[PDB]
Design a protein around this ligand. Structure first.
Ligand SMILES: *[C@H](CC(=O)Nc1cc2c(Nc3ccc(F)c(Cl)c3)ncnc2cc1O[C@H]1CCOC1)CN(C)C
Ligand SMILES: [Zn+2]
Length: 179
């Protein structure tokens, strides 16, 4: 029985509860927390490739006013992002099931989608989606705890405090809306 579990799901929930945010830049930024999954139930001798893309969690824009996230805008549907190929692809099912599969090197951008860079629209809520392709029978896997709003700068200052607390790299690289 094919099973895909989320690694460090409780840490993801700390950001999930406050509505997670991820920075997008012209050159791209790594995610925090990193997406890692545990896979069981593959054919260990078959060949598989692991793919990652980001789907719209909803079809409207978002704003952060008065210390809370508010929907808005005429809902225009957003197409999924480009796919990022896990660098170990293709590989045996035994390779994917021996250790957590990590997508730590993916970089989210708002400009250039080539290679390890994924282009996202600012102020939209995205959800990572993992594709396992037998080397084409495809299975797709997502986790609501990993949803986030792509932003060019951190809106919720509580998120900034969480990122600084748990991401060791946040400290090395370390206006409000009202009406
Ligand atoms: C983004 C580039 C991109 O993703 N290109 C691309 C994707 C692709 C896929 N994608 C895919 C989508 C959903 C899904 F569930 C799975 Cl398992 C896979 N699958 C197969 N081959 C692909 C090729 C590909 O590209 C190469 C082919 C054409 O150019 C290079 C572009 N955005 C506009 C979406
Ligand atoms: Zn989902």
């Amino acid at each position: 029985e094919l099973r895909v579990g989320l690694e460090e799901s409780e840490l993801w929930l700390r950001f999930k509860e406050l509505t997670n945010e991820m920075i997008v830049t012209k050159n791209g930024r790594r995610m925090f927390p990193v997406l890692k999954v545990n896979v069981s139930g593959l054919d260990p001798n078959a060949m598989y490739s692991f793919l990652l893309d980001f789907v719209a969690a909803d079809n409207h824009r978002w704003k952060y006013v008065n210390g809370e996230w508010v929907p808005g805008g005429k809902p225009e549907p957003q197409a999924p992002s480009c796919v990022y190929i896990h660098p170990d692809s293709p590989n045996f099912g035994a390779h994917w099931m021996k250790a957590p599969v990590s997508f730590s090197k993916v970089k989210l951008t708002n400009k250039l989608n080539g290679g390890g860079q994924i282009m996202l629209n600012s102020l939209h809520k995205y959800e990572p989606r993992i594709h396992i392709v037998r080397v084409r029978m495809i299975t797709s896997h997502c986790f609501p705890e990993t949803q986030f709003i792509a932003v060019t700068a951190y809106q919720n200052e509580e998120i900034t405090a969480l990122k600084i607390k748990y991401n060791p790299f946040a400290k090395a690289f370390l206006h409000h809306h009202h009406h």
